[PDB]
DNA sequence: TATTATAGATCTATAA
DNA sequence: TATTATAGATCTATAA
């Protein structure tokens, strides 16, 4: 997929270039994953698939030694049970759930940083938060990049948090044929069990002259 | 219901006694609201009902001159569309949705306070966040009071926010005969359309053992 | 009348 | 098996 980046608290210079390369190469090679909506007025319309996207990232990063679902130490258990990925002093959250998760993930990363919790045998120094662009139709209230950017930009204007955060937005060019993975799961909602998966070409149609696009496959 | 409170940034010294009395009396008068779960393997079991509880609070506070769903100003539109209630300088959020909403609600309230957002023709001075105690069985991942307490306590330790916040936890005694409002809605999930509502007798069964902590949630039974 | 953006409701996934 | 705890998925409600 294509990507856009916004950095906070100097993450551009603090983030280890090699660790960033490992995350970036994964995101750039990844096809857009889509599935059918089960929302009442649009059953069957194609939407961004967080399940397939999350699994794709996990399958690429774990073999590169990024530990998945690292447990959060007991002393900070009120902040959660685990973190998506971590390697050395860098935490990664892939966040396609509802929008308040952006501020929950940001604040707990701030506390992980202030208290020096160990990520992967090193104290936490930087967080990477991966999100999807507004351009893709998706479940209602799922977080999107521009909303995350606007929220963190406002927190930065008021000097609210200090931890370095690289915010990543997954995007595609509009009206251009791209690689897509289209999946049908065993149940119309929540299931992560694949029933059918197709690798195809498709595109995101733009009706703008911002509205979200419409995904089509061939 | 009974209430437990935790104040941050001296919300106790800042909160107008009369505004607090209007919120407190409403919450104290309110019976515990329950409904049937549709979660696998516990279909029909009673759980805390956020729909009925939210409606009860709205029906009590609006007549008391609290404004409901106050729009958030354009310059902060990326923080949201509106706030649950407001009266003069006080904002109130009733939060029974999933746990990340606590930090979303805390952080945006911090930003409203820094910029001095008008709430009801007056700059915001304090926020009240209403939550339900852990003791009640409820939808998975719904926010609960002790979790909000522990998170805000950590933020306070690290000086993350300066806005005064009164955190309220709705609770009840265990193994005590209490009145409970039981509501049935037109669909098994998400509906706010009431098909039947009644006040019944019930209690919250304490399922803790010597090896749990008190992290064992209660079981609600009605008669 | 149809979209869209929250806000709120509340399920399943998964491991301890 | 049973349950607790998120974390993630993703719907409906309801007012622009
Ligand atoms: Ca995630
Ligand atoms: Ca609310």
Which chain D positions have some atom within 7 A of a protein CB? Answer: 3-16
Burial of B43 (0-12, 13-18, 19+ CB in 10 A): exposed
User: Which CA-bearing residue is nearest the C1' of D10?
Assistant: A139
Place of tokens 């008669």: B223
Paired sense of beta strands A82-87 and A90-94, if any: antiparallel
Contact of A150 with chain B, judged by CB distance below 8 Å, is answered with yes
Does residue B147 approach strand C to less than 7 Å at its CB?
A: no
B158 touches chain A (CB under 8 A): yes
Residues of chain B in contact with residue A160, where contact means CB-CB under 8 angstroms, are 107, 110-111, 160-161
Q: Which nucleotides of C are covered by protein (CB under 7 A)?
A: 3-16
Q: Which two tokens stand for residue B66?
A: 């609290």
Separation in Å, CA B166 to CA A211, B87, B123, B151: 39, 15, 17, 14
What does the buried/exposed string (b/e) look like for B110-123 if buried means 16 or more CB atoms within 10 Å of the residue's CB?
bbbbbeebebbeee
Residue A14's contacts (CB-CB under 8 Å, 6 or more residues apart) are A125, A126, A164
Chain A, 93-122: which have a CB under 8 Å from a chain B CB?
Answer: 97-108, 110-111, 114
Q: Please give residues of chain A from 170 to 209 whose alpha-adjacent beta carbon (CB) lies under 7 Å from any atom of strand C.
A: 187, 189-193
Listed in sequence order, the residues at least 6 apart from B36 whose beta carbon sits closer than 8 Å to its beta carbon are B43, B44, B45, B46, B47, B184, B188
Domains of chain A: 2-218 (3.40.91.20)
Bridge partners of A180, per DSSP, are A32, A200
Q: Which pairs from B115-119 meet CB under 8 Å and 24+ separation?
A: B115/A158, B115/B75, B115/B76, B117/B72, B117/B73, B117/B76, B118/B73, B119/B70, B119/B83, B119/B86, B119/B87, B119/B88, B119/B89, B119/B90, B119/B91
Residue A111 to residue B155, Cβ atoms within 8 A: yes
Among all residues of chain B, which has the CA nearest to that of A141? B80
Q: At what resolution in Å was this solved? A: 1.5
Q: Which residues of B are annotated as a binding site?
A: 84, 94
Q: Among all strands, which nt has the closest C1' to A143 (CA)?
A: C6
Helices B100-115 & B145-157 angle (0-180, nearest 10): 50
CA angle A26, A30, A33 (to 5 degrees): 140
Cα R_g (chain B), whole angstroms: 18
């Amino acid at each position: 997929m294509k990507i856009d980046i916004t950095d906070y608290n100097h993450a551009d210079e603090i983030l280890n270039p090699q660790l960033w390369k490992e995350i970036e190469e994964t995101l750039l090679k990844m096809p857009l994953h889509v599935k059918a909506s089960d929302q009442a007025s649009k059953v069957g319309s194609l939407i961004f698939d967080p399940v397939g996207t999350n699994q794709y990232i996990k399958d690429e990063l774990v073999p590169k030694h990024w530990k998945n679902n690292i447990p959060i130490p007991k002393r900070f258990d009120f902040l959660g049970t685990d973190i998506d990925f971590g390697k050395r002093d860098t935490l990664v959250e892939v966040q396609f759930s509802n929008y308040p998760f952006l501020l929950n993930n940001t604040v707990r990363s701030e506390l992980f940083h202030k208290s020096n919790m160990d990520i992967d045998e090193e104290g936490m120094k930087v967080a990477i938060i991966i999100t999807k662009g507004h351009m893709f139709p998706a479940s209602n209230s799922s977080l999107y990049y521009e909303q995350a950017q606007n929220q963190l930009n406002s927190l930065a204007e008021y000097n609210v948090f200090d931890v370095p955060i690289r915010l990543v937005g997954l995007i595609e060019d509009f009206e251009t044929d791209i690689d897509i993975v289209s999946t049908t799961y065993a149940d119309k909602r929540y299931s992560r069990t694949i029933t059918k998966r197709d690798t195809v070409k498709g595109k995101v149609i733009d009706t703008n002259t911002r509205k979200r696009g419409t995904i089509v496959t061939y």
